[PDB]
Amino acid sequence: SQFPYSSAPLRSVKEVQFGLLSPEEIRAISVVKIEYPEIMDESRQRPREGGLNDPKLGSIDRNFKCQTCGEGMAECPGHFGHMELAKPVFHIGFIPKIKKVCECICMNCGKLLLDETNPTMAQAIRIRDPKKRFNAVWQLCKTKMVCEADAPVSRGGCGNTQPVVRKDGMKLWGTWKKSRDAQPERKLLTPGEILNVFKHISPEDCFRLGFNEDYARPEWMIITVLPVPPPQVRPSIAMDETTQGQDDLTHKLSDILKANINVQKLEMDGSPQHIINEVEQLLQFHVATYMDNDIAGQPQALQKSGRPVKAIRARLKGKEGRLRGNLMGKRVDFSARTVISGDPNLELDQVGVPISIAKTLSYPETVTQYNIHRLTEYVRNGPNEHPGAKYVIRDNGDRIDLRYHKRAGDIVLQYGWKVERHLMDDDPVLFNRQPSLHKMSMMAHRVKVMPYSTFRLNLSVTSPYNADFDGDEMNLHVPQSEETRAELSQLCAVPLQIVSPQSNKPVMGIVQDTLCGVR
């Protein structure tokens, strides 16, 4: 209901298809090319077009509406831009896989070292698990020291001995044994070399290698075009309001652009080999640390402050990664926290709720004939009076703020409108403690409005929360919809929790004063 009208039909996600990006795909999707390291045109507002801060990428501020979609911050999901590398570069996260794929195929003919003739391999092809299939294929083909130009009848091969590829950290060296012994002249398996080698690989070997011609085409594992995410993904931090500091990701993107531009301007001047190699390694280093700053064995990249950079791998890993940070769990709305205290005189399924909270939180309520009067009363109570409401909602989704509305009486409720009435007694709300070891650490209680600013629990229910009033705290949550209210009532009410499926026995019990007394 929050979103405006949209013509596209609404459905749900059923399938997620993983697979790399074909560079032509990136070009087909990108809406701009990024060429200018200078983000700000001349410090005269209007950042340089075609720069990292291009207005085509996506609106970053309230005032400016995204040029491409034509909407504002509310709706625009940002947009993408591509970035060409003069020199194709590796992907730091595929070094072992790329190495293995190279081991599995020839150098020059660039085909599988073995045919279906060997029954071991034809058997391996029968593996449906692409990962295990590739594992076995590598297992067989890692001992084929020489690529056959002829059938083990020409197979179209090269016949040269396949080099032994050993991982030199960030680079790859192949030590050939040229045709008793010859001088072994290894060389750097340069990215373009591998890309061209992969470019002609057959769909036959592709599928037999576990890859997929439609989505996972092996050569794309080498970085050629690097898409640039709009600012949405790399917003800047206003250190002190007017003072604005640049996101480290934006800095890394700019530095990659600089290294790329420099790599462009070597071939048009004196390029004594050594300089080109060093600059190439530097560009690869930028693009790598840009995508993982924790590459084992080598020093990390820093800012001018010396602190290690924030590569996306960090953004996703660790406790605070996107998953464990904001997807598995997240900070939520309509909550409240406080201390807890005893209350021998409350029911089992009830809980002291300080008045201020019930005044703060609120719950939408559709307009029917059965509550029109009561809702009008809550309206006229004003938001600062319990019971009271906080907003009035139209059929179109507008919110009337009762704070800045002096015409409270002149509002006429309408069927289907919603009124965020205050919390009232007997309503259902969740309840919780941390840690939430066993499912008897969460329950759905009923509301009772009271003075003072603490929650109160019946002294019996402490055991399931494993709580005590020596200073402990609790959290709260509130349903914002009726179906949710129904579910809470029917599934998480305290009474249903009395016996613990852990040990098929009652979990609560008469404790402390009640017990020692009734004795």
Binding site: A8, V16, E71, V233, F334, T484
Partner: protein, 93 residues
């Protein structure tokens, strides 16, 4: 609304509540996708009532899905990592 809270909510088998607690009381967001490539790239202008997928040249096979903003953020961070999750609204097999 930490992990363990999610797990307790699952154990109590309350689905819709968990859904909305992670949807409407949090980063509720809408997007559009192309039914061919399956991606979110469809350039749309709502008030202008137009739609198209640049790569797919696609003007009619477009849908809209409601997802947590953090999820879309994760997808974009991914497809900047050369990894492209394509979203399909129908199963294949």
């Amino acid at each position: 609304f930490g992990e363990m809270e999610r797990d307790c909510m699952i154990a109590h088998g309350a689905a819709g509540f968990l859904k909305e607690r992670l949807m409407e009381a949090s980063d509720a967001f809408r997007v559009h996708v192309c039914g061919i490539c399956g991606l979110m790239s469809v350039i749309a202008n709502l008030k202008k009532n137009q739609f198209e997928c640049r790569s797919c040249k696609n003007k009619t096979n477009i849908y809209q899905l409601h997802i947590p903003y953090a999820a879309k953020l994760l997808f974009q961070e991914l497809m900047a990592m050369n990894i492209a999750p394509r979203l399909y609204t129908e199963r294949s097999g």
